């Protein structure tokens, strides 16, 4: 999983991107561990 609402549930190697608009958060990982 590469996007979520709990930042932590993302277990991303680098800091996930916060994509917030008005009311709307979501966090997305841009760093990939193969």
């Amino acid at each position: 999983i590469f996007i979520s609402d709990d930042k932590d549930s993302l277990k991303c190697p680098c800091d996930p991107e916060m994509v917030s608009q008005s009311t709307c958060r979501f966090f997305v990982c841009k760093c990939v561990e193969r």
Partner: antibody, heavy 123, light 107 residues
């Protein structure tokens, strides 16, 4: 303004150990990952390790694993690199650092760097 | 893993010229980072995400690429630009830095 103030670098005999520590202020320490990154004296730039936030998952560079331990004390806005078993190629400038500001972050980039702390490993 | 090499090593320009420095990767990567550094102090973020200007940074600077080809370019080099520059990706773990190009200025 953000600030990241590294310290306790210095000299150490091959095999020895050292605990670098970096003092963060100017933000909410616990909303960010921290990273240690270093620069060999040939100016080669190596990422060394990453400690998350909230739950605190730690990730290492190979050439280093289970000798160094990254860590955070969120209660003191503080970041640590515990280093054991030092080899001379660990000689370098150690930089603690973190992702950028809002609009310019979340990409795997290092948006603010400490000022460096010099680690020498020698006889 | 995703080892970067940067060309050239030493680029020389007189104040006024455009210069371009390029950063190849072993495979695909969707974002490049550039930091400017000068002796005595630690890398400053220069260009974020392939092509955003880290705040502070002169609009004579620019970045692009994609896939395995990236670069940073100065429209019209100045003197206060003599420095080493470094590329950095984190598309794929671990993250890596290029060995970095050094601009020197003609006079």
């Amino acid at each position: 303004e953000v600030q990241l103030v590294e310290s306790g670098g210095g000299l150490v005999k091959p095999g020895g150990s050292l605990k670098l520590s970096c003092a963060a202020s100017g933000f909410i320490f616990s909303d960010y990952y921290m990273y240690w990154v270093r620069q060999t004296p040939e100016k080669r730039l190596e990422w060394v390790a990453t400690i998350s936030d909230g739950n605190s998952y730690t990730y290492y560079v190979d050439s280093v694993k289970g000798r160094f331990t990254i860590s955070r004390d969120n209660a003191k806005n503080n970041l640590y690199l515990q280093m054991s078993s030092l080899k001379s190629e660990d000689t370098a400038i150690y930089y603690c650092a973190r992702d950028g500001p809002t609009d310019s972050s979340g990409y795997g980039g290092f948006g603010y760097w400490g000022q460096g702390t010099l680690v020498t490993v020698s006889e | 893993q995703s080892v970067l090499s940067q060309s050239p090593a030493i680029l020389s320009a007189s104040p006024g010229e455009k210069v371009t420095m390029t950063c190849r990767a072993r495979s695909s990567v969707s974002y490049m980072h550039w930091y400017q550094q000068k002796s005595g102090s630690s890398p400053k973020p220069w260009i974020h995400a392939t092509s955003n200007l880290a705040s502070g940074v002169p609009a004579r600077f620019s970045g692009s690429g994609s896939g395995t080809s990236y670069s940073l370019t100065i429209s019209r080099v100045e003197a206060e630009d003599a420095a080493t520059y470094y590329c950095q990706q984190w598309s794929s773990h671990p993250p890596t830095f290029g060995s970095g190009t050094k601009l020197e200025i003609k006079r």
